[PDB]
C-alpha cells in the first residue's frame, strides 16, 4: 500500500467547456464520460491503477509492472518505486530511445542491426531502456528487437517505458489496486488510442489529466533521467551512471530534444542513426558537412533548408527556424556520434 | 523406487499402535465414525494463493528453459550444422 | 524469384476480397508461408470477429501453424474459448480420425 499512498493520479474534475466539439472539451473524451488547472481543473488523488499486466494475446507470455503517476510526482519518489517495490537494481546504463511517434518502416538491414544493437548493449551492462511505451514509432521496433531476443536468450532486459496513460487503448481495463489485470494486445485500426507494446517489462504510465494528448511523459522522462544520473554507481571512483540518447527517425520536435541533451550538463551523447529517415538523416547529413560545427557553407545550408521543408513539409521560414536549432545542435557534433548504416560507421 | 510411493502412503494411513495393540486404535476409529455419522487420500501441501503464483511462474520459467535448450542443442549438433552449411553452399 | 509465390499471391490479390476470405484460402491450402507475409501485413484491416471465426476453422482442420500465427496476431485463447465453441470442437467431423465416438 506504499504505491497507493505515495503517488497520485489526477482526475477530470472540471467545468466541462464546449470547446470545438461539445463532447471533446479540454480533456478530449466525450462530455458525459468526463468525471492541469487550466480548463481541466484536475484533482490529485491516490492512484487508481497499479499492479501487474498479463499481456493476453501476441503469444509470448510477459508480465509488466504498471504504475499510473502524475507528471508532478517527484523523481526521488519514482526511484523508490523502481528499486524497492518493483525490485530493480540501479542500472549501469540508461538508453533513452527518443524517436518518432508515427510508424516508420525502416530498411530490413537497419531493423536487424538496430535489433541486435540495442539488445546486447542492454544485456551486458544491465541497462534500463527508457523508451516511450505505446506500440507505434520507434517503440514498436524496440519491442520487435525485444521479440527477437526473448526467443533466443534468457537475460531480462529492463525496458522501463514512460508512455501516456491518456493515450493507452482500453485504459479502463487496467484499473485496479494490486490486481493482475489481463490486457488484450489487440489494436483496433480505427481507435486513435494505441495499445502498449507487450514486450516491455515495466511501465510508468503518465497522467496529464486529459485523454489523447501527449506531453506528460516529456517532463517526467527528463526529470527522471537527471535523477538517475545523479545517483552514482558502486565503482566509488566518482561516476554517475552514464545516460545515452539513441535516436532514430524522429519528428521535427526531436531536434529540440537533441539540443536539450547536448547542451545539458553533463552532455548526454546521442547515437543518432542514419538510414531511417526524417530527423535522424538531416542531423546525420548535417554531421557529415559540419567542419567546425555550424561551419556549413551557404549552399549546403540551403540544402538543409529544402530537406527540412520537404521531409517534414515545413514552410520556408520554419525550415530556417529548425536550422537555427540544428546549427546549435551541431556545434557540439563531438557528442553526436552517428552510427552510419552498414558502410563503415561502427 | 516406484513402489516406495505405496510404502509411504499405506503406512501414513496405518494406525499408530502395533498390530498386537491395533485393537485399541480400531475401536477409536469405530467409535469416532459412529459419532460423526450420527452427527481424500494422499500427501498434498495445500499452498496459499500468493505462493501458488510463485510456483506457477517458476514453472513458466522451466517451460521457457526446456524448449530453449532443446532448440540450442538441435541448432548446435553436428547433424544440423552440416545440414545448414550444405544448404547455404547450395545457395 | 519463384512461380510458387507468383501463383498463390496472384490468387490472393486477384480475388481482391476482404481479409477473412483471403485467410480462408490459405487455410484451405495449408500455407502459412503466404499468410504470414501478405495476408497478415502491416495496416491490414481485420473485421470484428473474423480472426475468432478463422480460429475455429483452424482448430477443426488441424493446422498447427495457423493457430500459432493467429495467436501471435492476438485471438486471446482466454476470450475465444466459450462453452458453445468448445462443444463445436468436440463435435467437428473434419480433421483426423478419433476414438471419441
Contacts of A154 in chain B (CB under 8 A): 64-65, 68
Q: Are A325 and A261 in contact (CB under 8 A)?
A: no
Which residues from A are below 8 Å from B64, CB to CB?
154
Residue A38 sits at φ, ψ, to 5 deg, of -80, 95
| Distance of alpha carbon C45 from alpha carbon A186, whole angstroms | 12
Least Cα separation, residue C60 to chain A (angstroms): 20
CA–CA separation, A321 and A310 (whole Å): 14
Kindly report whether the peptide bond that precedes residue A266 is cis, defined as omega within 30 degrees of 0. Answer: yes
Q: Quick check: A118 and A95 in contact, CB under 8 A?
A: yes
Q: Considering only alpha carbons, which residue of chain A is nearest residue B72?
A: A152
C-alpha cell recorded at residue A167: 493515450
Q: Measuring CA to CA, how many Å separate C101 from each of A263, A319, C27, C60, C96?
A: 76, 75, 27, 16, 13
Given a contact cutoff of 8 angstroms between Cβ atoms, the answer to whether A112 and A166 are in contact is no
**Grid cell 469416532 in the structure block, residue:** B32
Instruction: Choose the mutation target among C18, C49, C76 for the interface with A, i.e. most A CBs under 10 Å.
Output: C76
Q: Which one, of A88, A100, A121, A123, lies nearest residue A202 by Cα? A: A88
- For residue A239, give the 3-state DSSP assignment: coil
Interface size between A and B, measured as CB pairs under 8 A: 6
Chain A CB contacts of B65 under 8 Å are 154
C-alpha C75/C-alpha C72 separation (Å) is 8
Task: Check CB contact of B60 with chain A, cutoff 8 Å.
Answer: yes
Method for structure elucidation? cryo-EM
- Identify all chain B residues contacting A60, using CB atoms and an 8 Å cutoff: none
- Residue B11 grid coordinates: 503406512
Of A150, A147, A191, A199, nearest in space to A173 by CA: A191
From A166, A341, A322, select the one nearest A257 (Cα to Cα): A322
A61:B60 CB<8 A:
yes
Contact A129, A97 (CB under 8 A): yes
Per DSSP, the three-state class of A43 is strand
Cell 524496440 -> residue: A142
The tally of CA atoms less than 13 A away on the side-chain side of residue B34 is 6
List the resolution, Å.
3.2
In chain A, whose CA is at the least distance from the CA of C43?
A: A189
d(CA B49, CA B32): 33
Cβ atoms A27, A39 nearer than 8 A: no
Q: How far is CA A336 from the centre of its chain?
A: 19
Within an 8 Å CB–CB cutoff, is residue A57 touching chain C?
yes
In order of A13, A230, C10, C45, the CA distances from C56 in angstroms are 46, 55, 26, 20
The DSSP letter of residue A83 is I
Asked if residue A203 has a cis previous peptide bond (ω within 30° of 0), the answer is no
Amino acid at each position: 500500500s506504499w504505491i497507493e499512498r505515495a503517488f497520485y493520479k489526477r482526475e477530470c474534475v472540471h467545468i466541462i467547456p464546449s470547446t470545438k466539439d461539445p463532447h471533446r472539451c479540454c480533456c478530449g473524451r466525450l462530455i458525459g464520460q468526463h468525471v492541469w488547472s487550466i480548463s481541466k481543473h484536475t484533482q490529485l488523488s491516490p492512484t487508481d491503477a497499479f499492479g501487474t499486466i498479463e499481456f493476453q494475446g501476441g503469444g509470448h507470455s510477459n508480465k509488466a509492472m504498471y504504475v499510473r503517476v502524475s507528471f508532478d510526482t517527484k523523481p526521488d519518489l519514482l526511484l523508490h518505486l523502481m528499486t524497492k517495490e518493483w525490485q530493480l537494481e540501479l542500472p549501469k546504463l540508461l538508453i533513452s530511445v527518443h524517436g518518432g511517434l508515427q510508424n516508420f518502416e525502416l530498411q530490413p538491414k537497419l531493423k536487424q542491426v538496430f535489433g541486435k544493437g540495442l539488445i546486447k548493449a542492454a544485456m551486458t551492462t544491465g541497462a534500463w531502456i527508457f523508451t516511450g511505451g505505446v506500440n507505434t514509432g520507434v517503440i514498436r521496433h524496440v519491442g520487435d528487437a525485444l521479440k527477437d531476443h526473448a526467443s533466443k536468450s534468457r537475460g531480462k532486459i529492463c525496458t522501463i517505458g514512460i508512455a501516456p496513460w491518456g493515450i493507452v487503448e482500453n485504459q479502463e481495463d487496467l484499473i485496479g489496486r494490486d490486481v493482475v489485470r489481463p490486457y488484450q494486445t489487440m489494436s483496433n485500426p480505427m481507435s486513435k488510442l494505441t495499445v502498449l507494446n507487450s514486450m516491455h517489462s515495466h511501465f510508468i504510465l503518465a497522467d496529464n489529466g486529459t485523454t489523447g494528448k501527449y506531453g506528460a511523459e516529456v517532463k517526467l522522462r527528463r526529470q527522471l533521467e537527471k535523477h538517475i544520473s545523479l545517483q552514482k554507481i558502486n565503482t566509488r571512483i566518482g561516476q554517475g551512471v552514464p545516460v545515452v540518447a539513441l535516436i532514430v527517425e524522429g519528428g521535427p520536435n526531436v531536434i529540440s530534444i537533441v539540443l536539450e541533451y547536448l547542451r545539458d550538463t553533463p552532455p548526454v551523447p546521442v547515437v543518432v542513426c542514419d538510414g531511417s529517415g526524417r530527423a535522424s538523416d538531416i542531423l546525420a547529413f548535417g554531421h557529415k558537412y559540419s567542419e567546425e560545427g555550424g561551419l556549413i557553407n551557404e549552399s549546403l545550408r540551403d540544402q538543409l533548408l529544402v530537406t527540412i521543408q520537404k521531409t517534414f513539409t515545413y514552410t520556408r521560414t520554419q525550415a530556417q527556424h529548425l536550422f537555427i536549432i540544428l546549427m546549435e545542435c551541431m556545434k557540439k557534433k563531438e557528442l553526436i556520434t552517428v552510427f552510419r548504416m552498414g558502410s563503415e560507421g561502427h | 523406487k516406484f513402489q516406495r510411493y505405496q510404502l509411504i502412503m499405506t503406512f501414513h494411513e496405518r494406525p499408530v499402535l502395533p498390530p498386537p495393540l491395533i485393537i485399541f486404535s480400531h475401536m477409536t476409529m469405530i467409535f469416532q465414525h459412529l459419532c460423526c455419522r450420527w452427527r481424500d487420500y494422499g500427501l498434498k501441501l495445500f499452498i496459499t494463493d500468493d505462493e501458488l503464483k510463485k510456483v506457477h511462474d517458476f514453472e513458466e520459467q522451466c517451460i521457457e528453459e526446456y524448449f530453449r535448450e532443446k532448440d540450442d542443442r538441435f541448432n548446435s549438433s553436428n547433424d544440423e550444422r552440416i545440414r545448414v552449411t550444405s544448404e547455404r553452399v547450395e545457395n | 524469384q519463384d512461380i510458387d509465390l507468383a501463383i498463390l499471391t496472384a490468387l490472393l490479390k486477384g480475388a481482391n476480397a476482404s481479409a477473412p476470405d483471403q485467410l480462408s484460402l490459405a487455410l484451405a491450402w495449408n500455407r502459412v508461408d503466404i499468410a504470414r507475409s501478405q495476408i497478415f501485413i502491416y495496416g491490414q484491416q481485420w473485421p470484428v470477429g473474423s480472426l475468432e471465426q478463422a480460429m475455429l476453422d483452424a482448430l477443426v482442420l488441424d493446422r498447427v501453424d495457423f493457430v500459432k500465427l493467429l495467436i501471435e496476431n492476438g485471438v486471446s485463447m482466454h476470450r475465444f474459448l466459450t462453452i458453445s465453441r468448445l462443444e463445436e470442437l468436440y463435435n467437428t467431423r473434419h480433421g483426423p480420425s478419433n476414438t471419441l465416438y
